[PDB]
């Protein structure tokens, strides 16, 4: 006879002792561990709700990985790559460059947790959480290497992260904050509750129905198959958190939510936003950007929060009005700087796309419109000069990502400037610099891309210049528009 | 300047070298992006605490090699390759598990095996937790995503045997309900002299922050010591006292465990490329050797009174 | 000599760098802004340009000066139409 | 100092034991527990994710009573009666007569699991059920008794239950069926994981979102407070089925978690379809009932499915074209008939709305817009006589709610009828009928309202003789049109 | 020929009754919908599975009665002022843990009674789990919503009794970890003669099906019995042994005991309106007072 | 010789109760019928209205009586052009 696992489980975790060689600061230091001065007794009460056991994860991931790799090799043949629509080859690419390697960090996040959370619990549900992200690595190395030999542009899944370009930055400079560059519980409040539990479950979810959509039923196959590991590891931040609360700490909590939440939004707009808005084809469209945040981010954020007992962040209003603007610019901006990305954007906005946009945020037309019918009228021309860029764009000295507003007949753009230790930063949200003034240490010293270009660190200082540094090493690396501006011939 | 390139079969870093490498190589080759910048780490000021904590205790360690990112693991393991692996071995331990107690196996063991058991067995499972912490260290500061791989999975063996040790420490307490198994274990890992070298030799290694220092000190000198001091000696205590399951059970375990040391000889080659690394790993070894040693004795001590 | 600013063009939809020179007017540096933005995202208008500091109710005097102003390298300004 | 949960947690459902001095049977008997044979030692495993004890639960329920009796005393003078849309009063009206008294009969439901699922986790948390459906009877019998005063159709918050009323019939026959008839595990597939999970939950979420748009935050707080609670007994047909899975019972699992999604969607189709699309004001609106039940309802059913190695149910194309059809249908049947409703139902065809309504209905004028057409027509001319019935509607045998299809140029119109022990039911769709013939013993001799009508129990056999057999005790007790026709103005 | 009506100032079944409704009226009164039609308890096939229970184990109960409905907790309570009277009872309880842990309580009680404990106070929590059972039991087949509002509070009390138990079998473990606490009393409910009477007993009682055996044999036999035999008695020997918390512990329980005695009194009142319900229940009481007595003296031949 | 059908008549939305006579003819039928339909949520038509077995493609004749035609009480009928 076998004895079911509840019998047993508590002895897996209780792994926590009185240190006597050594203090327990100097085996948990607070800037690994991030206990906050709480006593290791008290952290004992950490309680990871969704149990399992080494021998279960063994045979249940083995299963996964067998249908994974069965149906990428069944479907070989299927001519994926020559017969999607070009918006669906740009979301894989954008996908697979700005998560990869981020995936495989997120190894290290967990790992952190692993080695230096004083909640036994964390610690063993940090191990499947470093085996769940190796995974996630691995597979999205493997799955997109077979189209290297069809697409340069597919070489970003792995080169992305080793790169100055400047949407890889703004990943890095995100996922170094709240996976690889902070304390254990800071990792498990700012990755695991807030981004996964908050952000990717979702995402994903989304994801690989727009895959099947797609036709793109390996893709399909493999995000479905990876969100299915999310919650194993995902829910660590719960616990945690109600910990912090129980023992004093529901400020210090806060403001960790806050701020990782923030931070994830700017980079979820960037990158995600102009994808369903604009990359996805009209007839494929069952929701707007907005529409998804309101509907699966914020009200579960909202629930999540108040059923710990925290409160929504401070700056709630501000994300509210941001889901009505944000992504519109940013689209804007990786589309007209677009030989800066290593995919390639769709404009998305022949009259009928422009009509349904106008629908989902009424005024579009008469804000981003005004700008868009520039662009039109220079591509009717072939003024390919005039929308190719010429300078740098100005870039938040938290996000990464350029400084945007609201154009046309509505023209509000607020960059928020700080004067900090003799040197001026600009950000693009009144959050963004508030998040910089919560850790000033972790950010004081940064320098974005035009701070480098600036202080010399990029020549030549012309677009050659900054594609080099960025990484490129082809002009078919560049970015470019998706359709070759076949969208003009429909204006 | 830019000019036209034909597509790539493999990754830009592998391309020039391959045409179609490895799944190994495809999948865990180059990953650590941040060992490119010296100065920054991690995409952060330049002296946030940890791009502190990695400049000195992963970039500075005196281990010296310009190439740590050639290192191979020698079983070239990944994830998926892992799984199917530790699956049959799970198989095999689990199929063991359920015979044995359909025999009442545990009843059979020789008179006062039971308090040997609650003594020198059941609070391995701090021994083991804290290989388990120890390993998902290197693993976070090693300077190659294949060196790190081979952690990531030492970790997962790791917690392998905790769990092992946990579920025996519970069946047993069925048929020995008066030994204190699943009760004393943290008390005797404090308090019992025989425990008392384990558990100071790892509080200190735990404390060894250098990837380097941290890596000789768990896999070429505390890992071995365990195999040839505890897991050894406990197999064959356990045949001395007609505990068939516990020697079969450590089998198991010591294939991990030489899997271990297998990927660490390879390591250790590697590094030993640059001949100046012979006396920091040799410098090492001696150094946290006399703390193994006093470990393994107290223990052995511990096992074989009475 | 080479004077970097964050300029917002009225109308446009971002902040761009712009490098202009210590001896250019304000209509000068108005011009030098207005070439990335005008025809490429922003419809060509007539009107005067004046610059100001970024959300400022104040104007800088259209012969002025980048080195006459005040302004420091990559502060923030703003071009937009008279009044 | 004390203790926390996880270290003592495992001893509050250490309570199964090997019965001696009655057998196992005896102790659960299928017929109340729906163990289907498997063994007691195999429930041990059932594990509850949202864990919670006692004092947790008295203390976190005590301030949220608080809460939500402060509220209503602090806006007692907020006029809401006199103030809001009279779309908005019928929906408070249909909303409290359907759910107030079926919470209470949820009781029964969890009462059920908590003396005779073989799983202690299911037990202790059933415990915990019986106590929310008790707070959420009593909350929602308090709150509406505030308007007894102001409208006798309030009184239906308390007697819809207590009445053969067509809609209180539909609602019975549906929660005597998944909640108070069955034994503790179908209780815990059909009701907790089928119904609440997979409807309610969002349904009040929406609900609470509806309630502060119409300026009426008594009814949202008090909806919110009551959603807050869902997931403590809810959560309990989850682990139900992963156990019934594991242990070679997967088709068994299927067929409930197939008939409770499905007679649920009927009836949530007539109460709540026709609230979506057709009494909340224009301007109001956010998304359509078919975009609620294909994104919030049909996608979280399909994905919390997969999650459990289930499958989607056999109807499923069947139900993705009833969610575009269905309620428009049951809207239409509920407005004409609206005398025999305890509300009073908004007819929502302004041309404003009509234009709404095409919108996210292609073809929706040409089906249904047909019927409306004549009606409204007749409303202009005051013949009034032609917008009341003078008859009754043919009825499902299985879901108590009227046989329907798609009206106008695009007429299809499906009875599925069955022969059985030699009398003839008729039901409003194939999955319907397959209903019926999954467990014949709960439904063969029951008798729908027009088969009462037909054996002679109601008397006369007319309208009025109808009413009166339904409940109804004064002649503003009938439902009447909420904006008594002045929609009409607007079509000219 | 339907009249014009006014509004009513509170529910139609309630408006008659001269008296203004309480609270606990609105909320309670009348609510089972399931005795309205005799031969079709649920809106289902009148002889569908769960029908034919209800007409056999509830309608057609030899305890009878021509209004149930207008049975009347004499403490009125509903889930608020319930949830607001046990919250503070709570808050006792968790102040009496809290601190009397801090003074290390339980390591000054006398020797050996750690073992005591292990065998007769632990293994409660199956006792306090089959009463909880039990009171589900009345709840769901009672046939007036009053009555069985009585009995939800009851199961959650029942809980609430069970939730202490194994806390303190936990804690007490922390301070003498071999004396099987929290390990052996499902072996001991199962197999150790002074439990056997009293799991003879419940198992027996759980199969009691008809609503009014349910009640008269949980309420007027059982749960007297436990005060009388086991709560008392163990607050007799902690006492002796230096135990000061488990009297005040079982203090609070008793006050939730005596509470469900109450009601129960009220409800043989409300039944002996009809005389033949003396001999009926006075019947149940004789017929299942032997197996309590039983019980109660194995019970005590153990803890003596 | 009260004989109740169910009868769904072509564009309406649902199918309805409707008690006709042993002895009326199919045109009977389809008149008293059309009383709870016509004008009040269908367009008044010209043209012959025609009863069957609900979904059948065999027309009753207009002359044949419920009584000769084999249907049976509560049985579903349409009634088309
Ligand atoms: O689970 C995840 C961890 C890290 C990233 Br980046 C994406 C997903
Ligand atoms: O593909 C993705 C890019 C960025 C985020 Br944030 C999430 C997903
Ligand atoms: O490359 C760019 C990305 C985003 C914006 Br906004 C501007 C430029
Ligand atoms: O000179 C430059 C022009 C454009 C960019 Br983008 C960067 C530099
Ligand atoms: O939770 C609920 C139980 C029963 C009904 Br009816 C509604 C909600
Ligand atoms: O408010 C509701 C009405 C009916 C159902 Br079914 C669910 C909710
Ligand atoms: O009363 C009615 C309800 C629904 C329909 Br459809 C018809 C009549
Ligand atoms: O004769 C009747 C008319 C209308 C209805 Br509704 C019921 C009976
Ligand atoms: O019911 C309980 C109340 C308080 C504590 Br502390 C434990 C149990
Ligand atoms: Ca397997
Ligand atoms: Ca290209
Ligand atoms: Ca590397
Ligand atoms: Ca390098
Ligand atoms: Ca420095
Ligand atoms: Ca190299
Ligand atoms: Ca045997
Ligand atoms: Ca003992
Ligand atoms: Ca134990
Ligand atoms: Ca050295
Ligand atoms: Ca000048
Ligand atoms: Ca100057
Ligand atoms: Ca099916
Ligand atoms: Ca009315
Ligand atoms: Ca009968
Ligand atoms: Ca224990
Ligand atoms: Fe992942
Ligand atoms: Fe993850
Ligand atoms: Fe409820
Ligand atoms: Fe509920």
């Given at each position: ?165 400047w949407?890889?930055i703004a990943?890095?400079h995100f996922?170094?904050d ?80 806050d701020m990782?939440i923030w931070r994830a939004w700017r980079l979820?707009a960037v ?43 401070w700056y709630?209003?501000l994300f509210?009005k941001d889901?009505?603007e944000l992504?519109?610019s940013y689209?804007?901006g ?59 764009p100005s870039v938040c000295n938290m996000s990464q990502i350029p400084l945007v507003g ?6 509000n753009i607020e960059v928020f400037s700080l004067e900090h230790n003799?040197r001026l930063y600009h950000f693009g949200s009144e959050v963004d610099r508030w998040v910089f003034q919560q850790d000033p240490?972790q950010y004081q010293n940064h320098m974005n891309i035009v701070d ?40 | ?43 952060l000021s ?261 | ?5 964050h300029?917002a ?5 971002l902040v761009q760098l ?36 970024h959300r ?18 990559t502060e923030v ?7």
């Amino acid at each position: 006879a076998m004895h079911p696992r509840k019998d047993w489980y508590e002895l897996t975790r209780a792994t926590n002792w009185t240190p006597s060689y050594v203090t327990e600061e100097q085996l948990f230091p607070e800037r690994m561990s991030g206990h906050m001065g709480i006593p290791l007794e008290k952290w004992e009460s950490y309680d990871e709700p969704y149990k399992t056991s080494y021998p279960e994860y063994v045979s249940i991931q083995r299963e996964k990985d067998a249908g994974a790799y069965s149906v990428k090799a069944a479907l070989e043949r299927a001519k994926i790559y020559e017969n999607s629509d070009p918006g669906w080859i740009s979301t894989l690419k954008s996908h697979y460059g700005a998560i990869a390697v981020g995936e495989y960090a997120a190894v290290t996040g967990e790992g952190r947790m692993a080695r230096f959370s004083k909640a036994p619990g964390n610690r063993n549900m940090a191990t499947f959480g470093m085996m769940d992200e190796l995974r996630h690595g691995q597979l999205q190395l493997f799955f997109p290497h077979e189209y290297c030999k069809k697409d340069r542009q597919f070489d970003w899944a792995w080169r992305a992260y080793h790169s100055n370009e400047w949407a890889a930055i703004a990943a890095k400079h995100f996922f170094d904050d709240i996976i690889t560059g902070r304390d254990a519980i800071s990792v498990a409040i700012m990755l695991t509750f807030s981004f996964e539990t908050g952000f990717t479950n979702m995402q994903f979810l989304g994801l690989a129905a727009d895959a099947a959509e797609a036709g793109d039923y390996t893709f399909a196959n493999l995000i479905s198959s990876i969100q299915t590991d999310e919650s194993r590891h995902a829910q660590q931040g719960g616990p945690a958190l109600q910990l912090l609360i129980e023992n004093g700490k529901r400020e210090e909590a806060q403001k960790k939510v806050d701020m990782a939440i923030w931070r994830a939004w700017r980079l979820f707009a960037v990158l995600t936003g102009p994808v369903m808005d604009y990359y996805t084809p009209l007839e494929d469209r069952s929701q707007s950007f907005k529409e998804f945040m309101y509907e699966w981010i914020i009200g579960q954020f909202e629930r999540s929060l108040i059923d710990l007992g925290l409160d929504k962040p401070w700056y709630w209003d501000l994300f509210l009005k941001d889901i009505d603007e944000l992504h519109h610019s940013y689209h804007m901006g990786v589309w007209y700087w677009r030989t800066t990305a290593w995919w390639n954007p769709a404009a998305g906005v022949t009259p009928e796309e422009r009509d349904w946009l106008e629908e989902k945020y009424p005024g579009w037309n008469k804000r981003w419109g005004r700008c868009w019918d520039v662009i039109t009228e220079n591509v009717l021309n072939d003024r390919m000069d005039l929308v190719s860029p010429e300078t740098l764009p100005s870039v938040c000295n938290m996000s990464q990502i350029p400084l945007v507003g609201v154009p046309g007949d509505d023209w509000n753009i607020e960059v928020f400037s700080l004067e900090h230790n003799g040197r001026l930063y600009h950000f693009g949200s009144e959050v963004d610099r508030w998040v910089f003034q919560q850790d000033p240490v972790q950010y004081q010293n940064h320098m974005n891309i035009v701070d480098r270009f600036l202080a010399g660190q990029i020549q030549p200082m012309t677009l050659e210049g900054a594609l080099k540094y960025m990484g490129f090493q082809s002009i078919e690396e560049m970015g470019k528009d998706a359709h070759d501006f076949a969208w003009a011939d429909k204006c | 300047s830019f000019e036209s390139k034909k597509p790539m079969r493999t990754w830009s870093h592998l391309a020039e070298m391959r045409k179609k490498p490895s799944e190994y190589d495809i999948v865990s080759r180059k990953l650590h992006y941040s060992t490119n910048n010296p100065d920054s780490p991690w995409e952060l000021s330049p002296d946030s605490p940890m791009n502190l904590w990695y400049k000195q205790y992963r970039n500075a360690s005196p281990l010296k090699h310009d190439n740590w990112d050639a290192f191979t693991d020698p079983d070239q393991l990944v994830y998926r390759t892992y799984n199917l692996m530790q699956d049959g071995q799970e198989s095999y331990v689990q199929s063991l598990f359920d015979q044995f107690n359909e025999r009442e196996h545990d009843q059979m063991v020789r008179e006062g095996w039971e308090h040997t058991m609650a003594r020198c067995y059941s609070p391995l499972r701090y021994l083991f937790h804290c290989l388990q912490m120890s390993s998902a260290y290197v693993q976070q500061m090693a300077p190659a995503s294949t060196i790190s791989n081979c952690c990531i999975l030492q970790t997962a063996d790791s917690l392998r045997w905790l769990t092992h040790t946990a579920y025996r420490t519970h069946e047993l307490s069925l048929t020995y309900p008066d030994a204190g198994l699943g009760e004393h274990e943290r008390e005797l890992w404090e308090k019992e002299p025989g425990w008392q070298g384990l558990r100071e030799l790892m509080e200190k290694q735990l404390t060894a922050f250098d990837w380097g220092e941290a890596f000789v000190s768990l896999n070429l000198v505390v890992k071995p010591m365990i195999v040839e001091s505890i897991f050894k000696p406990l197999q064959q205590q356990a045949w001395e006292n007609n505990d068939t399951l516990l020697p079969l059970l450590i089998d198991s375990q010591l294939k991990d465990a030489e899997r271990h040391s297998r990927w660490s000889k390879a390591l250790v080659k590697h590094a030993l490329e640059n001949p100046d690394n012979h006396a920091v790993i040799e410098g090492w070894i001696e150094k946290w050797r006399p703390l193994a040693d006093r470990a393994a004795e107290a223990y052995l001590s511990m096992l074989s009174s009475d | 000599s080479a004077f970097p600013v964050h300029a917002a063009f009225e109308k446009d939809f971002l902040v761009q760098l712009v490098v202009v020179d210590l001896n250019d007017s304000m209509d000068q540096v108005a011009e030098k802004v207005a070439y990335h933005c005008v025809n490429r995202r922003v419809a060509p208008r007539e009107g005067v340009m004046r610059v100001r500091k970024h959300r400022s109710t104040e104007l800088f005097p259209r012969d002025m000066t980048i080195a006459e102003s005040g302004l420091n390298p990559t502060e923030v300004i703003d071009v937009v139409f008279e009044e």
